[PDB]
Each structure stands twice: as structure tokens, then as C-alpha cells.
Design an enzyme around this catalytic site. Structure first.
Site, PDB file in Angstrom:
ATOM      1  N   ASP A   1      -7.687  -5.047  -7.041  1.00 25.02           N
ATOM      2  CA  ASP A   1      -7.236  -3.722  -6.076  1.00 25.02           C
ATOM      3  C   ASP A   1      -8.368  -2.602  -6.473  1.00 25.02           C
ATOM      4  O   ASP A   1      -7.926  -2.343  -7.351  1.00 25.02           O
ATOM      5  CB  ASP A   1      -6.065  -3.679  -5.649  1.00 25.02           C
ATOM      6  CG  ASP A   1      -5.864  -2.741  -4.567  1.00 25.02           C
ATOM      7  OD1 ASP A   1      -6.375  -1.834  -4.149  1.00 25.02           O
ATOM      8  OD2 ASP A   1      -4.578  -3.383  -4.004  1.00 25.02           O
TER       9      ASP A   1
ATOM     10  N   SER B   1       1.013  -1.168   0.072  1.00 24.43           N
ATOM     11  CA  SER B   1       0.011   0.019  -0.012  1.00 24.43           C
ATOM     12  C   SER B   1       0.729   1.363  -0.039  1.00 24.43           C
ATOM     13  O   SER B   1       1.709   1.413  -0.591  1.00 24.43           O
ATOM     14  CB  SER B   1      -0.914  -0.125   1.128  1.00 24.43           C
ATOM     15  OG  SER B   1      -1.727   0.797   1.058  1.00 24.43           O
TER      16      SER B   1
ATOM     17  N   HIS C   1      -7.351  -5.303  -2.152  1.00 24.77           N
ATOM     18  CA  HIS C   1      -6.790  -4.704  -1.236  1.00 24.77           C
ATOM     19  C   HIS C   1      -6.617  -5.317   0.175  1.00 24.77           C
ATOM     20  O   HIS C   1      -5.692  -5.587   1.052  1.00 24.77           O
ATOM     21  CB  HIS C   1      -6.759  -3.168  -1.038  1.00 24.77           C
ATOM     22  CG  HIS C   1      -5.579  -2.588  -0.572  1.00 24.77           C
ATOM     23  ND1 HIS C   1      -4.458  -2.025  -1.336  1.00 24.77           N
ATOM     24  CD2 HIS C   1      -5.354  -1.939   0.477  1.00 24.77           C
ATOM     25  CE1 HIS C   1      -3.598  -1.382  -0.796  1.00 24.77           C
ATOM     26  NE2 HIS C   1      -3.782  -1.377   0.234  1.00 24.77           N
TER      27      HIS C   1
END
Ligand SMILES: CCCCCCCCO[C@@H]1O[C@H](CO)[C@@H](O)[C@H](O)[C@H]1O
EC number: 3.4.19.1
Length: 574
Positions: free
Chosen positions: A517, A438, A549
Site C-alpha cells: 500500500d 482506509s 490500496h
């Protein structure tokens, strides 16, 4: 390679991990557990655990004390995080009914009073506060950006919103009539909130200095400090307030912290608890219960003050041993700022030895004395781990956190780089690697492009490579996020995107990315692969199927973590 790496990675992921959500079905603990291969919801009442959901889920809404149902939040888009809500009568575990009035959307938070479900959600065109009751779905208000429901008492709804400049505002609404009232503090950001019997909002306020408890009156917005019976809390001088909430018996429970560790207070009085970090506190059968974690303790549920475990996944003594030690050091950065950094010394590596600077995501998050599966796996694999709380991190005050605003791939990258220098100069590291997911993956890309030669190799998972294309692919919540982080500047969005500095990369790079994601999209990463290829750069990539994610199965966790450790072990070979 090593089948040894694989078994350890599998075993670390396999250890059960729990989070405490509340008390339901009269007097039973409601917990969410990463167990039996995935994320599930369970009821606990002193012995065997009872599964409430069927297929895996992502989370549950906060139930009011004792309600007879649980509201499951489940991704119905194979990882893209368009969630649907499913209710389960706690008297009939395993039986689900979809709340069809709520079309799929990114569910950000929610509470269930038993008569109404109040939640915040994000669609392509907006972020809003919703209420679903016997009469159907109502949009109570349109929010400026990410917003989360914190509490409901009577007709009053209280929540927290990231409505501008990285600051967190308090907001209220009415269950019956809707509406929005935003309360901003000129001293800092609100971090937690719970409605008092007096119908005012008790909230934690994090300032440049200490964090403190205040009372906000919704009617006029006046704010005044809240003094508690016991002075333990005030003399603790917390720097952050994790959570607070009223217990059924009327007592005020507060979990606050400083330097990566938390403490529990009831009406201001300290309550002994296992060292590390705690989550919400609930009263169960007249007893206090909370969740607990530390760098060597996977998230578990315990009774206070004894610390006896109610629900705990056991960490094998051998894996426990791979972590020889840990320290909190204060890295000196380029501008003289001190970067609070957690360090894990591997019992399977020499000193000086192979070291990984593992960068946290967020950016609004922190490396604390809390369990980190990624960190534990590197230690088990023979790498020391350096986790720095670069500017933008939570846990060290409002000032430190807001420095990142308008400056991505700037001062915070300097902190990450200083942590690398500290690793070398202090004698811990013989060679350095950078790894992150991330925002952390974004940092790997920023490091390799803007600091070539600093690290020997980099691992970038679910990373940001281009703010511009990500922005165009983002829903209302993430578009607002990007605007706040970049100060709304196209210059910043462009210049601070690694995709525009590929020529400078000189170290091997490993890309790991979930195909669906919806936070940090895959599309820009495919373009990055094209640039790396065309420019003759060395690289590897692993795209994970039907995942996004938010990982919610043990196998998917293996798919995102294993490639990373294999890559580093291989680089370590030289
Ligand atoms: C390799 C790392 C994979 C991380 C994927 C984690 C997916 C679920 O996340 C976990 O859920 C548990 C139950 O609520 C919590 O107690 C844990 O702290 C949390 O990480």
C-alpha cells in the site's frame, strides 16, 4: 470459520460489476468490469463483450467520443500504484503497446483525444499535468496538490484541483502551450466541469446550501449562473453534482443528487432512471446509457429511461434476501449536528442484534444508496450495518465536508460514536462492532484508543496509524493531502495519531493490510504491532502479498474481506 461465510463472501465478490467509461471504436460502449477474476476493460456493442487488455488493469483514460483506441492504466509495482500507460487499438483487442515516454508514476486521471493523451500524475517531488502527443511528453504545469483532468475541447484543458484547505478549484491549461490558471470560488467547491461549444467552462458548484450550475470564462475568470431550457434540474434543488458533460448532439447531461440518491437531467429535463445512484451518461446509437447502483444492486450499465440492463452481474436471490431492509436515519451528534446515516437490517440477525458501524474511507466520500460489498457481506453474515456520513463526508454540502479540515480524530469521531449510540438507543443493536478501511480504518483505531468500551471489537483495514511517518513516506500528492487535513500542524499530526495512545486500547483488534500500500503504508502498522505486543494487547493481523490500496483481483478482495468477517463472527461467539 464457517464454510458458509466463505461461500457468501466469495459469491458477493464474484458478482460482476461495471463502470461506464465512454464510446469508442466508432459507436461501441467502453466499460471497465470487475469480471472473470479481475478488473478488465471491454467493448460492448449489443451482445458479447470483447476484452481489450491482457493482464489486469486499474482503469482506463476517458476517451473522446468514437476514438479508435483505449489507454490502459496499469500498476507495474505489485500494488504500490506506480502505473504505466498502455494503448490498445480498438480494432486489435488484446494487443498492447506501452507508452514508454511515460516513466512509472501515480496516475491520477487522464483523457485521450485520439491525438493526445493528457493526464495528471504524482511523483515523489510533485504533482503535474502532462501531455503526450506525436512529439513526445510535455509537462504542461506543476500542480499544488491532487488534481484531475475533467475535459479537453480544442486547445483548452479543464480540470479540478484540491489545491488548499479541502476546497476544490477549477483549473485550465493549453494543450499546445501549457500553463496554469486556477479559479477558486468564495462560495464553495467545483465538483465537475465540461467545456462548452463557446469555449467556456460549465461546472457544478457545491456551496454550503444547494449545488448549482455555473459558467466560468477562462479568459477573465468571471462566473455567472447557467440557466437551462428545462427547469426540472433547478427545481430538484440538488445538494451535490456528480458529473456533467456535453453529448455529441450538443445537449448538456447532468447527474446530480441529494440524500444519497441521484437523478439524471438532459438540458435541464429530468430523465427517469432506476432508483439509487448513476455515473456518467453517454449517447450510444442515439440512446441514453448510464451506470446504475443501489444498496441491493451491484454497479451495472442500463438504458434510460426504461432502466433495461445492457451489462449486469446478477445478485443471487438468496444473497439479495439477506438484506431485509435499509433506511436513512439522521443521527443526533454531540454538537447537535444531524449525521445522515444509511442502515442495513440483516435478514439473518435478530432485532436487537449484532451490529457493525462500518465507517467509509476518504474522508471525502459518502455512504449512499450505492452497492457496498463490505456491507452486503456483513448482512449475509448476520450483522446489521450502520454507515454514517460523519463530517468530512461528501454529499451534504460544502460546510459539512470542510468541518473535518484541521480536526482529524475529533468531531468526525464524535459522529461515528453518536451513530453507535443511536444503534443502541433505537433498539437495533444488542452488541456493537466498528469496521473500516482506509480513513475508515483510521477511525477504528481512533475509536479503540479514544473511546475504549464503546465497541466490543474493531477491524482496521489499510488504516492510518501515524500521520507523521505516513507523511515522511508519502509522495507529493499525499504529503499535500496530509498537510491540508491536519492544517499543517505537527501537534495535530502527532496527537491525532493512534500510535501515541496504544495504552488505552482495551478491545480485541483485527489489522488487515496490503503489503505494498503506497497511500496508507504498512511500515507504521508494523510499529503498531510492536506496541500492541509489548503492551500485552490482544490482536490479530493479516498482511496481503503483492497488493496495495487499489484491489484489482477477486482473490485479493477475498483476502482483505474474509479475515474481517471471520474475526467478527468469532467475536460474536463472545
Ligand atoms: C471486498 C471489497 C473489494 C473491493 C475491490 C474492488 C476492486 C475493483 O473495484 C470495482 O470495479 C468495478 C468495475 O469498474 C466497479 O463497478 C465497482 O464499483 C468497484 O468497486
Amino acid at each position: 470459520e464457517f464454510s458458509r461465510i466463505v461461500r457468501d463472501v466469495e459469491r458477493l465478490i464474484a458478482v460482476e460489476k461495471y463502470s461506464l467509461q465512454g464510446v469508442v471504436d466508432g459507436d461501441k460502449l467502453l466499460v471497465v468490469g470487475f469480471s472473470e477474476g479481475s478488473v478488465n476493460a471491454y467493448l460492448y456493442d449489443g451482445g458479447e463483450t470483447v476484452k481489450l487488455n491482457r493482464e489486469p488493469i486499474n482503469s482506463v483514460l476517458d476517451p473522446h467520443y468514437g476514438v479508435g483506441r483505449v489507454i490502459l492504466v496499469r500498476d507495474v509495482s505489485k500494488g504500490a500504484e506506480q502505473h504505466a500507460l498502455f494503448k490498445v487499438n480498438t480494432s486489435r483487442p488484446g494487443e498492447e503497446q506501452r507508452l514508454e515516454a511515460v516513466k512509472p508514476m501515480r496516475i491520477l486521471s487522464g483523457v485521450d483525444t485520439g491525438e493526445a493523451v493528457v493526464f495528471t500524475g504524482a511523483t515523489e517531488d510533485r504533482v503535474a499535468l502532462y501531455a503526450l502527443d506525436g512529439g513526445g511528453l510535455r509537462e504542461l504545469a506543476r500542480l499544488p496538490g491532487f488534481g484531475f483532468v475533467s475535459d479537453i475541447r480544442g486547445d483548452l484543458i479543464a480540470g479540478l484541483g484540491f489545491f488548499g484547505g479541502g476546497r476544490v478549484s477549477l483549473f485550465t491549461s493549453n494543450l499546445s502551450s501549457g500553463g496554469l490558471r486556477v479559479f477558486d470560488s468564495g462560495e464553495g467547491s467545483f465538483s465537475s466541469a465540461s467545456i462548452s461549444p463557446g469555449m467556456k467552462v460549465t461546472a457544478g458548484l457545491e456551496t454550503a446550501r444547494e449545488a448549482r450550475l455555473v459558467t466560468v470564462d477562462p479568459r477573465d475568470g468571471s462566473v455567472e449562473d447557467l440557466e437551462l431550457p428545462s427547469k426540472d434540474f433547478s427545481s430538484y434543488r440538488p445538494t451535490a453534482i456528480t458529473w456533467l458533460g456535453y453529448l455529441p448532439d450538443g445537449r448538456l447531461a447532468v447527474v446530480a443528487r441529494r440524500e444519497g440518491r441521484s437523478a439524471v437531467f438532459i438540458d435541464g429535463e429530468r430523465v427517469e432512471a432506476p432508483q439509487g445512484n448513476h455515473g456518467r451518461v453517454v449517447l450510444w446509437r442515439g440512446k441514453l446509457v448510464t451506470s446504475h447502483t443501489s444498496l441491493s444492486t451491484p454497479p451495472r450499465i442500463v438504458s434510460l429511461p426504461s432502466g433495461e440492463p445492457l451489462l449486469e452481474g446478477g445478485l443471487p436471490e438468496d444473497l439479495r434476501r439477506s438484506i431485509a431492509g435499509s433506511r436513512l436515519v439522521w443521527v443526533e451528534s454531540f454538537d447537535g449536528s444531524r449525521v445522515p446515516t444509511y442502515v442495513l437490517e440483516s435478514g439473518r440477525a435478530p432485532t436487537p442484534g449484532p451490529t457493525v458501524v462500518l465507517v467509509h474511507g476518504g474522508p471525502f466520500a459518502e455512504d449512499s444508496d450505492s452497492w457496498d460489498t463490505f456491507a452486503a457481506s456483513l448482512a449475509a453474515a448476520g450483522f446489521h450495518v450502520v454507515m454514517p456520513n460523519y463530517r468530512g463526508s461528501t454529499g451534504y454540502g460544502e460546510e459539512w465536508r470542510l468541518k473535518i479540515i484541521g480536526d482529524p480524530c475529533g468531531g468526525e469521531l464524535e459522529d461515528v460514536s453518536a451513530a453507535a449510540r443511536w444503534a443502541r438507543e433505537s433498539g437495533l443493536a444488542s452488541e456493537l462492532y466498528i469496521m473500516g478501511y482506509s480513513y475508515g480504518g483510521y477511525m477504528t483505531l481512533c475509536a479503540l484508543t479514544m473511546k475504549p468500551g464503546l465497541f466490543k471489537a474493531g477491524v482496521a483495514g489499510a488504516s492510518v496509524v501515524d500521520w507523521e511517518e505516513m507523511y515522511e513516506l508519502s509522495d507529493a500528492a499525499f504529503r499535500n493531502f496530509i498537510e491540508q487535513l491536519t492544517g499543517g500542524s505537527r501537534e495535530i499530526m502527532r496527537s491525532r495519531s493512534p500510535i501515541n495512545h496504544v495504552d488505552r486500547i482495551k478491545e480485541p483488534l483485527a489489522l488487515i493490510h496490503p503489503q505494498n500500500d503506497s497511500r496508507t503504508p504498512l511500515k507504521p502498522l508494523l510499529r503498531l504491532m510492536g506496541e500492541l505486543l509489548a503492551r500485552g494487547k490482544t490482536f490479530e493481523a493479516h498482511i496481503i502479498p503483492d497488493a496495495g490500496h487499489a484491489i484489482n483481483t477477486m482473490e485479493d478482495a477475498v483476502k482483505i474481506l474474509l479475515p474481517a468477517v471471520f474475526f467478527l463472527a468469532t467475536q460474536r461467539e463472545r
